[PDB]
Design a protein around this ligand. Structure first.
Ligand SMILES: [K+]
Lengths: 97, 9, 271
């Protein structure tokens, strides 16, 4: 069992008001069964998922994304459930990272 | 083109 | 040098029915074909424009090979259950990587043919392309069967033969895409901290392929640095950043350095 590493970030440098894409990039997990959700102010967004790949160390990776328009005040997150962890792991978008 | 895994475990 | 590689995964689905079965092909780390048994009428599919030049014969023979592999993988999964004394009701995965790394002169630099069960090394063809490394007792049983069958000889024939030959063909036909590069567009961002000092973040954006070096220097010595893993933009290009914490008013003494195969030379920038 290998624990997923997550990054949450925009496609383009985030412009309040300018339309963009939010990504949730999940890597280094095994087994391949995983549940990934994207949240906007705590609520589930209805999200495309890349097809699954594995890397040369056998561990899987996938890219979730969704269309979005950043504002001063909207918070966003990626939540991941996988058998390697007791509890879902939530990572919040930081617009500077 | 890709390989064929014809020998089984 | 260049590489052609196939990455294959089978995942068993306890109850009744076929395992999930997937194959993906790469030339120098970029995906060009895929097969997925969960598609409606599953075929080998192109994943880039350049490989679409291949005719219906290619697509049909590759689809057939994938479906043949699906059956071998099904047998493989059931055999693995017996060797490890596992029950039918759990999900298990078998992965395989095979392919060739080839030099300028056309020499085969390394061939690969290796398997993992449930995420751990199972059996691998050694660099000599004649003997197998077996991770455990199950894989020793497999090894003895493959030694008797002369598996390695046939595997090596693919890796030295078709693998090399097809890689050269793909590079000839698709080198505009496969060898394409997009240099990084870099900039520095400036973030005052509550502590009164500044984070400088050096961004590299829009680059292809993935490999890049980002560093920070102070008085032209390297150094303190936070550095995210290279990540996909979602449009085929990659992103990375590196950051340091510096005094407010001393931003100008720090330089960010970017090396990437798409650049005519190393990039040097500041706030
Ligand atoms: K192929």
């Amino acid at each position: 069992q290998k624990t997923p590493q997550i990054q949450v970030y925009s496609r383009h440098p985030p412009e309040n008001g300018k339309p963009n894409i939010l990504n949730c990039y999940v890597t280094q997990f095994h087994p391949p069964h995983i549940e990934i959700q994207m949240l906007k102010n705590g609520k589930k967004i209805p999200v495309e998922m890349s097809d699954m790949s594995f890397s040369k160390d056998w561990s899987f990776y996938i890219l979730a994304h969704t269309e979005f328009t950043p504002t001063e005040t909207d918070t966003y997150a990626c939540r991941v459930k996988h058998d390697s962890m007791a509890e879902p792991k939530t990572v919040y978008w930081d617009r500077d990272m | 083109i890709g390989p064929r895994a014809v020998d089984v475990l | 040098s260049h590489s052609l590689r196939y990455f294959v995964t089978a995942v068993s689905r306890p109850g009744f029915g076929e395992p999930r079965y997937m194959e993906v092909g790469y030339v120098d780390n970029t995906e060009f074909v895929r097969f997925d048994s969960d598609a409606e009428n599953p075929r080998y599919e192109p994943r880039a424009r350049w490989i679409e030049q291949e005719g219906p014969e290619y697509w049909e023979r590759e689809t057939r090979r994938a479906k043949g592999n699906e059956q071998s993988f099904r047998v493989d999964l059931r055999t693995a259950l017996r060797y490890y004394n596992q029950s039918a009701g759990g999900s298990h995965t078998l992965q395989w990587m095979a392919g060739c790394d080839v030099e300028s002169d056309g020499r085969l630099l390394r061939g690969y043919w290796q398997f993992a069960y449930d995420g751990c090394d199972y059996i691998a063809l050694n660099e000599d392309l004649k003997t197998w490394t077996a991770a455990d007792m199950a894989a020793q049983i497999t090894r003895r069967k493959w030694e008797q069958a002369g598996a390695a000889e046939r595997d090596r024939a693919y890796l030295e033969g078709e693998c090399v030959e097809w890689l050269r063909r793909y590079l000839k036909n698709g080198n505009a895409t496969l060898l394409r590069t997009d240099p990084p567009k870099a900039h520095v961002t400036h973030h005052r901290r509550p502590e009164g000092d500044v984070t400088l973040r050096c961004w590299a954006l829009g680059f292809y392929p993935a490999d890049i070096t980002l560093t920070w220097q102070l008085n032209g010595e390297e150094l303190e640095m936070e550095l995210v893993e290279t990540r996909p933009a979602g449009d085929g290009t990659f992103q990375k950043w590196a950051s340091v914490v510096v005094p407010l008013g001393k931003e100008q003494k720090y330089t960010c350095h970017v090396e990437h195969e798409g650049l005519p030379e190393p990039l040097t920038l500041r706030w």
